[PDB]
Amino acid sequence: VIAKQMTYKVYMSGTVNGHYFEVEGDGKGKPYEGEQTVKLTVTKGGPLPFAWDILSPQLSIPFTKYPEDIPDYFKQSFPEGYTWERSMNFEDGAVCTVSNDSSIQGNCFIYNVKISGENFPPNGPVMQKKTQGWEPSTERLFARDGMLIGNDYMALKLEGGGHYLCEFKSTYKAKKPVRMPGRHEIDRKLDVTSHNRDYTSVEQCEIAIARHS
């Protein structure tokens, strides 16, 4: 089902401050080590008039290292898969909402994701492309009604120093029942590793490791 080496395909569409775009990605990684990378191409709507970093966390939780004593909600859901909804509520009132469908074909996960964002100030670091990536962070999860509810207080690093703060609230829903974990946490570090001049070709890397509270 889930091998030591896996790939994925991501398809994203979205609108941010009224700008429509589509992105296609090819990813690969080691799901039991919590390691993955992905290569993205903006296929419509490039160059984007806003910071790549708002899209980067919507581009793969099966690649999270889970210790043997915490049930792995995400890997168990396959082959059927799971869906998730997420809100990103920035401290100045900008909001993004994100929805995902996640499936699998052989050794390739398939992610279809939509994002809508609005009310980023037009001269602010998102719409002026002055963010410099996310701080490493811990999402805290727990179980309810066969789903997982995750919360993470994220922070975008700003050119000049300081942070732009964002509440991330996610609900993860397997398409069939799975063995439920208790309260637990995931530690992650996400980096952009490559990009062309106008961010129409981008690569990213992520490490994610689950642990108890």
| Domains of the chain, residue spans | 1-213
Query: Per-residue DSSP letters for 118-162?
Result: E---TTSTTTTT-EEEEPPEEEEEEEETTEEEEEEEEEEEETTS-
206 contact partners, CB below 8 Å, separation of at least 6: 35, 36, 37, 60, 63, 188, 189, 190, 191
| Radius of gyration (C-alpha) of the chain in whole angstroms | 16
User: Among candidates 162, 121, 104, which has minimal Cα distance to 16?
Assistant: 121
CB 175 within 8 A of CB 83: yes
The pair of three-digit structure tokens given for residue 158, joined into one six-digit string: 């700003």
193 contact partners, CB below 8 Å, separation of at least 6: 37, 203, 204, 205
For 8, counting Cβ atoms within 10 Å of its Cβ (0-12 exposed, 13-18 middle, 19+ buried), the class is buried
CATH topology of domain 1-213: Green Fluorescent Protein (2.40.155)
**C-alpha dihedral (23, 26, 29, 32), degrees to nearest 10:** 70
- Give dist(CA 98, CA 149) in Å, integer: 15
**C-alpha dihedral (36, 42, 46, 51), degrees to nearest 10:** -20
Q: b/e string for 159-175 if b means 16 or more Cβ within 10 A?
A: eeeeebebebebebebe
Q: What is the resolution of this structure in A?
A: 1.6
For 123, counting Cβ atoms within 10 Å of its Cβ (0-12 exposed, 13-18 middle, 19+ buried), the class is exposed
Give the H or E element holding residue 75.
helix 73-76
